[PDB]
Amino acid sequence: IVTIHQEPFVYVKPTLSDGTCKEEFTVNGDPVKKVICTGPNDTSPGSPRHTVPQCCYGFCIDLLIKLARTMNFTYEVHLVADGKFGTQERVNNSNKKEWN
Amino acid sequence: ERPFVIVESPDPGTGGCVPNTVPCRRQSAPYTKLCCKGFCIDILKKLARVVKFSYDLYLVTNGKHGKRVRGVWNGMIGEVYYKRADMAIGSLTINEERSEIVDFSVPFVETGISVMVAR
Amino acid sequence: DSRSNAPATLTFENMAGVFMLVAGGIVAGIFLIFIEIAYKRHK
Amino acid sequence: LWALVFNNTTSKIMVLVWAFFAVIFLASYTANLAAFMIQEQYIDTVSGLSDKKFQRPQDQYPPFRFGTVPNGSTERNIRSNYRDMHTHMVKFNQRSVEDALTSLKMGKLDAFIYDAAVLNYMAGKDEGCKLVTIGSGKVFATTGYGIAMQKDSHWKRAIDLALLQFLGDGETQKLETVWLSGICQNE
Amino acid sequence: VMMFVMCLTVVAITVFMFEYAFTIGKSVWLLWALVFNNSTTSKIMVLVWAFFAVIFLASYTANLAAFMIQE
Amino acid sequence: KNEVMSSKLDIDNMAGVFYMLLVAMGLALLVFAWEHLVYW
Amino acid sequence: GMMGELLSGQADMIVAPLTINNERAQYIEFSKPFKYQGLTILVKKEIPRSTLDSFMQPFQSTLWLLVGLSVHVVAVMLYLLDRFSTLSSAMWFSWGVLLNSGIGEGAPRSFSARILGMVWAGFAMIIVASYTANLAAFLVLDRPEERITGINDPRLRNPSDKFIYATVKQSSVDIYFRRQVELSTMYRHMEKHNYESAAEAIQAVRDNKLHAFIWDSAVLEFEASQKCDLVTTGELFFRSGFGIGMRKDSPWKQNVSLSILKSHENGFMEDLDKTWVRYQEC
Amino acid sequence: ANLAAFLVLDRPEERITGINDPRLRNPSDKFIYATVKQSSVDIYFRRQVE
Ligand SMILES: *[C@@H]1O[C@H](CO)[C@@H](O[C@@H]2O[C@H](CO)[C@@H](O)[C@H](O)[C@H]2NC(C)=O)[C@H](O)[C@H]1NC(C)=O
Ligand SMILES: *[C@@H]1O[C@H](CO)[C@@H](O)[C@H](O)[C@H]1NC(C)=O
């Protein structure tokens, strides 16, 4: 599964050194659900790369869970490479137009 | 004249410049390409489908609008009095001196002389 | 919430400009009423 | 009683009523004058071509500075009649609308004269809404734009009727509100 | 609060510059009474402080004329 | 429709100023008996 | 009508306020316009009620008497507190300090009495301060108090018997509403109240019989700025011109259409304006 | 009365309408408009001809 960092839907937060991520309940008392999301260089604009782990949680990620518990999935979530949502552009050599 | 007939370079990517625009050569071998748009232009388009024209354009150079100089006209009025064109659209005003040698249509935008100062 | 109630509240700037007027009253008179007092009193 | 009355038995009850009529009058005064000064219309220097400040520029202070981009049409109307106005008008601006507009924000001149339909447009869009036309919309020697066609053509009668079709159906109103539109218009 | 307390100082100083008569208690009634209307030592300060009321007391009015027209 | 002016009768605005207004008598009630043991 | 007696052959020229539009442009050969104008509505003025009525405007008659009575209570609140430690004069002490005049008498004595008097002055100040403000905003915002504006969904939308719209039969204005199908409602009413002469229908507006008149702007601006007591609602919603007329195939066509232009340059058409369409204001 | 007129005509802000305001159409310098690149919106503004 691929995703993208968007504020009110799916969050990206650094991992605790102990490998896990912090678990603070909601106001309703129920425990928040979170999953380990791998992904990009941890610093996007200028760097070769650093594929480091993260911890994600949010609206969609929750909808991912319930859907899973009704389909018997097994998922590995990773952020998208270059952040952009996606469109098709006519690259150089004018021959093929691919979806960036 | 900036609000009525505008000129703009073509889209280097697509090659043939954006629709809703009319291509317009420039009188002067490599005659440079650039396409026009604006109010007075959008008239002759809607005017073309009602009387069934076909048309080219070309921005005149020698003189701005047209006046008399020692017995010969320049500018747009020059390009109509000397059989080098059939119309001349854009920001052109009616008066007496012009309308003696070249016919005119009915005024479709009204104007005059005005005065402008600071606030 | 959305409110944007009252297109003002008189700043603590112009009143200072008003406060400056009375301040000059406090500073000025005493110096005159004290220093010049030595003159008109004795002779 | 009146001396007592203007701002410091059946005898005293009347001068009271006068004291009353003070605050009712005064408050009504300061109110009225508020609405009168909250009406934003202010006089602008000149009031037409016929005015003296244009006609005979030999006043003590330097004349209004007269900019007209030359060799156009407004020239051929001024030179034709007002000999004195023209011979003073060789000090001008020569970079058309752009020169006139900057030179006027920076005090290089004080008056400008040009075709009407581009002036009350350029003044339509302008940072801060800091320009106007002294006519309050007035126009002089009013004429209009046209389509110059060869003399005695056969094309004339056709596009002469396809124009009167557009104005007479408001289809030209759709254009005028797309290309001639300003922020400063309704303010 | 500033106008409340900055008023309260001209209450204090003026009885000091006048006691050296006017009752200590008495001086307090007149000044507030002054800023509210109704009653070279006493005069010099009370003169300009009197207008000082008229200056802002008239702006308050002007302010309400805005808060009642731009809403 | 042409009724816009909005002349305001704000009885609560009035009830606003009446707060410091009537309690002035409430400042007297607390100063009416406070004088009797004081004058005695 | 008038366009007929030219096309039939009874006269060779028509010098009158004739408009310019497509239909007549088929059969007549116009000239260059010699005046520009529009279309605008004429309505009867609305009265600026009075001063005496406005002087009580923020006096909404609710607090106007709630305070008119509460002035009395403090009077009987001090002497009834003063008699416990004169009364008739205390009733002359409120109505003075309230109106801030110097029409009073001896002041209250007790320290408590001093506290009581002082707040009354404070209450008084806020009242007149509130009054002078509320009246001002009552004068700016209640500016228009005007009749219907231009035609943007006013009472024009419903052909009730509250409003009556009129024109003159056999005009451009009449035709102009017929071809417009987007305004079908606007015309079905207009048929029932059309008039016969532009002059007699003006009289109807000065007679509370006719509410709105939709006619030219040149004739109908002089008509307001000169007669009196009549005003035109807003801007104009159409733009046209006038012009001489002449039959097809006329020799004069080319020549007269120069003079009309040649005179716009010489300020001639300007002064004819300054002669008898302006400088006649009410 | 003259103080009040000045305080009334200090009109702070009349920011914007929807996307039809003349501030939108003619972008001289004031009110520059910016979207996220390559997004579904930046294509919607290339497909509408107006
Ligand atoms: C319109 O006016 C012009 C100018 O006056 C007329 O041209 C003149 O016509 C007369 C008639 O024979 C000639 O003798 C003149 O020589 C013409 N002028 C010039 C400069 O040559 C013209 O005739 C007028 N139009 C009509 C229909 O009479
Ligand atoms: C204007 O007309 C004069 C006269 O022909 C000419 O010399 C000049 O180059 C023209 N343009 C400008 C900008 O003055």
Swiss-Prot record, chain A:
NMDA is probably regulated by C-terminal phosphorylation of an isoform of GRIN1 by PKC. Its phosphorylated state is influenced by the formation of the NMDAR-PPP2CB complex and the NMDAR channel activity. Disulfide bonds join 21-55, 37-56. Glycans are attached at residues 41, 72, 92. It is found in: Cell membrane; Postsynaptic cell membrane; Postsynaptic density membrane; Synaptic cell membrane. It comes from the Eukaryota. Belongs to the glutamate-gated ion channel (TC 1.A.10.1) family. NR1/GRIN1 subfamily. It is linked to Neurodevelopmental disorder with or without hyperkinetic movements and seizures, autosomal dominant: An autosomal dominant neurodevelopmental disorder characterized by severe intellectual disability and developmental delay, absent speech, muscular hypotonia, dyskinesia, and hyperkinetic movements. Cortical blindness, cerebral atrophy, and seizures are present in some patients. A hydrophobic region that gives rise to the prediction of a transmembrane span does not cross the membrane, but is part of a discontinuously helical region that dips into the membrane and is probably part of the pore and of the selectivity filter. This is Glutamate receptor ionotropic, NMDA 1.
Curated annotation (Swiss-Prot), chain C:
Changing residue 15 to V: Slight decrease in glycine agonist potency; no effect on glutamate agonist potency. NMDA is probably regulated by C-terminal phosphorylation of an isoform of GRIN1 by PKC. Its phosphorylated state is influenced by the formation of the NMDAR-PPP2CB complex and the NMDAR channel activity. The chain crosses the membrane at residues 14-37. It is found in: Cell membrane; Postsynaptic cell membrane; Postsynaptic density membrane; Synaptic cell membrane. A hydrophobic region that gives rise to the prediction of a transmembrane span does not cross the membrane, but is part of a discontinuously helical region that dips into the membrane and is probably part of the pore and of the selectivity filter. The extracellular N-terminal domain (NTD) is a site of allosteric regulation to modulate overall receptor function. It is linked to Neurodevelopmental disorder with or without hyperkinetic movements and seizures, autosomal dominant: An autosomal dominant neurodevelopmental disorder characterized by severe intellectual disability and developmental delay, absent speech, muscular hypotonia, dyskinesia, and hyperkinetic movements. Cortical blindness, cerebral atrophy, and seizures are present in some patients. Belongs to the glutamate-gated ion channel (TC 1.A.10.1) family. NR1/GRIN1 subfamily. This is Glutamate receptor ionotropic, NMDA 1.
UniProtKB/Swiss-Prot annotation, chain D:
Glycans are attached at residue 71. Disulfide bonds join 129-184. It comes from the Eukaryota. The record marks 7 as: Functional determinant of NMDA receptors. The chain crosses the membrane at residues 13-30. It is found in: Cell membrane; Postsynaptic cell membrane. Coiled coil: none annotated. Mainly expressed in brain with predominant expression is in the cerebellum, also present in the hippocampus, amygdala, caudate nucleus, corpus callosum, subthalamic nuclei and thalamus. Detected in the heart, skeletal muscle and pancreas. L-glutamate binds at residues 73-74, 115. Residues 31-187 are extracellular. Heterotetramer. Forms heterotetrameric channels composed of two GluN1/zeta subunits (GRIN1), and two identical GluN2/epsilon subunits (GRIN2A, GRIN2B, GRIN2C or GRIN2D) or GluN3 subunits (GRIN3A or GRIN3B) (in vitro). In vivo, the subunit composition may depend on the expression levels of the different subunits. Interacts with PDZ domains of PATJ and DLG4. Interacts (via PDZ-binding motif) with SNX27 (via PDZ domain); the interaction is required for recycling to the plasma membrane when endocytosed and prevent degradation in lysosomes. A hydrophobic region that gives rise to the prediction of a transmembrane span does not cross the membrane, but is part of a discontinuously helical region that dips into the membrane and is probably part of the pore and of the selectivity filter. Belongs to the glutamate-gated ion channel (TC 1.A.10.1) family. NR2C/GRIN2C subfamily. This is Glutamate receptor ionotropic, NMDA 2C. The gene is GRIN2C.
Swiss-Prot record, chain G:
Disulfide bonds join 228-282. NMDA is probably regulated by C-terminal phosphorylation of an isoform of GRIN1 by PKC. Its phosphorylated state is influenced by the formation of the NMDAR-PPP2CB complex and the NMDAR channel activity. Residues 89-99 dip into the membrane without crossing it. Residues 87-108 are annotated as: Pore-forming. Changing residue 134 to K: In NDHMSD; likely pathogenic; changed glutamate-gated calcium ion channel activity; mutant channels are activated at 8-fold lower glutamate concentrations and 5-fold lower glycine concentrations; reduced localization to cell membrane. Changing residue 139 to Q: In NDHMSD; likely pathogenic; changed glutamate-gated calcium ion channel activity; mutant channels are activated at 10-fold lower glutamate concentrations and 13-fold lower glycine concentrations. GO terms for molecular function: amyloid-beta binding; calcium ion binding; calmodulin binding; glutamate binding; glutamate-gated calcium ion channel activity; glycine binding; glycine-gated cation channel activity; ligand-gated sodium channel activity. Glycine binds at residues 17, 19, 24, 172, 216. GO terms for biological process: brain development; calcium ion homeostasis; calcium ion transmembrane import into cytosol; calcium ion transmembrane transport; chemical synaptic transmission; excitatory chemical synaptic transmission; excitatory postsynaptic potential; ionotropic glutamate receptor signaling pathway. The chain crosses the membrane at residues 61-81, 112-132. This is Glutamate receptor ionotropic, NMDA 1. It comes from Homo sapiens.
